[PDB]
């Protein structure tokens, strides 16, 4: 079915906050909104000149088709069904060159609308740059896997300009393309769906817009003291918005109770774009799983479905606490249209009544005064721990006055419900609030602190009179529920209707949470946080434990920002010997109050994660905070299942929660730790213990095949950019000069070459011949050799350390005989034995082959960054049936900012490479930045080669991330979409990666060309995390 859209690009002034306040917002005052919104001498305000896409009736562009009010600054909605040919007539009426570039969809090289080194010429680069007054017809076909069999009828894709994509997007050229299964549309709207909304969550950065200078000229009434480097000024140009509406100003999100709604969501921007969308008071699903928070990163694409309930005005907010207080909030309205309630139904409903007080403790984040992993004193000189535990003149130390939720037996708040051995691990968390689907939950909350507080659940149903957070206008008079003053008591009633419970496909119990909502951005960090567990009807025993489960554990990961605590002033007075001298604004004082922790515990002090070999364990993980809260919680020694996928590292973000199923199969003391580099260093690491508890057999676990690999750690000179031709050509084509902070030696920087240590394969146990890398492995770059294994194998890794200090080799996923990994000393060879049982391979919904990172354990952080990293691929044991071949291609991609500041080889590289090493200050911020190498397989700006395939190939891409808080990587392939999970049931062209995320993506190349492959985060594209792959004709 052939379709036509006419879309025009025009400059026009956008108003980020048409609506004012008026509005009563979560955790925002006049000051905070003025910061971003108010015009001044040095400040632009809320109106910016932007370039926007608009829809026209005709190839003449003589009249507009009106955008829906809620679309805001997004371009008009394009819809396509599988098999449609879509012609997008685009004309540019702005003052600089621009394009139209589509994600969901198949285009030839002449129809891509993106400029980069691709060996194309003339008849083919006309799409890539549309000057002022130029016009182009973009021919798109909905011919990839499009939406998968496990995807919704309609899914979210995007389009945007791609001259310099990040700057063009920031300028305002972004819109939605909704891609649907044949033929789910009627009159351009999905059948049996009452409402379709599209929302972009973005920190729209007007410092990056092309129109920044134009906007300084127009709105700054004195264009003098404005240093554009000024941090406070840059920040005032960051508009924390949905569809370009800030501070509750998004209009037109209305619907009726019982409406079947689709929300098409995406994130856009840079590293600060860690979003956590909450639709307050509503019940959401995605891919037939219950969702409570929707996380969105740059170019994250997702769609969710909901049936609107509970007539009223409801908040849509980002729960990234930094974003929330910068105005990222909107309202939507659910009207009572007298549509019929499917009035249910439920028998033997129970009341779960809890008695909970907020009260003061002195919370010690590490009672032993040591890092339990190393035995070291936390305040020992030169240690990383000392930053946080040092106590003296302007330094609080390891113990803080906190406010904490605590369970009592009754309404007199006299006798604690004492915390069992099962609940010792809870630590700082309040008691678990649990319920089954159908139940009523009552919570009698008594405030014994000096600040007003509340209880706000995430993921149960409350009437407006029971809501824990205040905002409006939404027709509420009484503040009682949202403001429980210092000696008052309030009894909350919430309910648990089935839409708020697990779906068919979900686990038995969902992890959720509750917290104080009087001021969310301070209260949680004050300590007012606890777990909630919501379960299928009939699944719990009388005490709340799940039926076929031996133990249940709750892990809350966060950077506890004591600077944000309500009690920061009491603590300054109580704990510093010189409170008058404390400057709260000092960066180093701030850092010292950031306690990187798990349940309030740090550096191995978390007690009570103890269990027996073979027991059935459920882990409920969750987090809260801001963009610093990107967590990869790694359980060494065991894997878990979740939604039929096997992993050993769970990614968390603000307000995210997960349920993981584990049956531990080896005795010992293991690490549960955050892999995120800064967090591990900062103390976010703990022990869990698996004990025998009886006996009994000597030797019973799975080995059949044996494979042996000879691998060494070799010191090597590594070049992140051995050519600069790709980079320079990209820039010629964009018409931009621009310097490079990472590669330009300047006066005294290192450049692109660094001494690193890397894993390399050898032919036998003599280690006299390095394996010569084939053409199909050229792409590996810094990665170690592919280690392949089948379920049931034993893998012998014979490891030689040919480098200058101790290192090791260990894999995620894999089973070993003990919890300790032996170091290999320089010149020593050591055999490591990796068992590959069923639990180290695909879960029932994984593709047949799954990737696991292997890495060194001696110093997790510094060994990674020094260069030791590689892919272990584990495949399901080969079926007995197969008659003929197929022709399978494998590529492994590692998205990582190599921080050469943390390399063991930094001093050698200072002395070897800078023209004047005397001049080098390691604490200088510009030098630090020069050594952050933003790469794919340790190569930048198109130097990653060997990604070559043919039309009709079957390709597995094994994508991986590791690293720091900042290593959020959203992997986008131009020219093809991919699929994942068993049988390629899900489809996309952006895959979200974080430290410890590993995934098989299947691709079926069909359009020839040379295609861009890049992370979609602004900072990372600009810094070089980009290459191409080439699809040749059959
Ligand atoms: C750590 O070191 C200091 C000595 O500067 C000492 O006062 C402190 O008690 C030590 N603590 C532990 C738990 O070893
Ligand atoms: Ca082109
Ligand atoms: Cu894109
Ligand atoms: Cu956000
Ligand atoms: Cu929920
Ligand atoms: Cu973390
Ligand atoms: Cu940190
Ligand atoms: Cu990235
Ligand atoms: Cu693209
Ligand atoms: Cu791109
Ligand atoms: Cu960067
Ligand atoms: Na200015
Ligand atoms: Na502003």
UniProtKB/TrEMBL annotation:
EC numbers: 1.11.1.27, 1.11.1.9, 1.16.3.1, 1.16.3.4
Keywords: Disulfide bond, Glycoprotein, Metal-binding, Oxidoreductase, Repeat, Secreted, Signal, Sodium
Molecular function via GO: copper ion binding; ferroxidase activity; glutathione peroxidase activity
Originating species: Rattus norvegicus
Residue ranges constituting the Plastocyanin-like domain according to the UniProt record: 73-180, 203-337, 428-501, 782-842, 931-1034
Family, similarity comment: Belongs to the multicopper oxidase family.
Pfam families per UniProt: Cu-oxidase, Cu-oxidase_2, Cu-oxidase_3
Cofactor: Cu(2+)
Protein name in UniProt: Ceruloplasmin
Top-level EC class as recorded in UniProt: oxidoreductase
Domain of life: Eukaryota
Subcellular location: Secreted
Subunit structure as annotated in this protein's UniProt entry: Found in a complex with MPO and LTF; interacts directly with MPO and LTF, which allows Fe(3+) incorporation into LTF, activation of CP ferroxidase activity and protection of CP antioxidant properties by MPO.
Role summary: Multifunctional blue, copper-binding (6-7 atoms per molecule) glycoprotein. It has ferroxidase activity oxidizing Fe(2+) to Fe(3+) without releasing radical oxygen species. It is involved in iron transport across the cell membrane. Copper ions provide a large number of enzymatic activites. Oxidizes highly toxic ferrous ions to the ferric state for further incorporation onto apo-transferrins, catalyzes Cu(+) oxidation and promotes the oxidation of biogenic amines such as norepinephrin and serotonin.
Catalytic activity, reaction form: 4 nitric oxide + O2 + 2 H2O = 4 nitrite + 4 H(+); 4 Cu(+) + O2 + 4 H(+) = 4 Cu(2+) + 2 H2O; 2 glutathione + H2O2 = glutathione disulfide + 2 H2O; 4 Fe(2+) + O2 + 4 H(+) = 4 Fe(3+) + 2 H2O
GO cellular component, one term: extracellular space
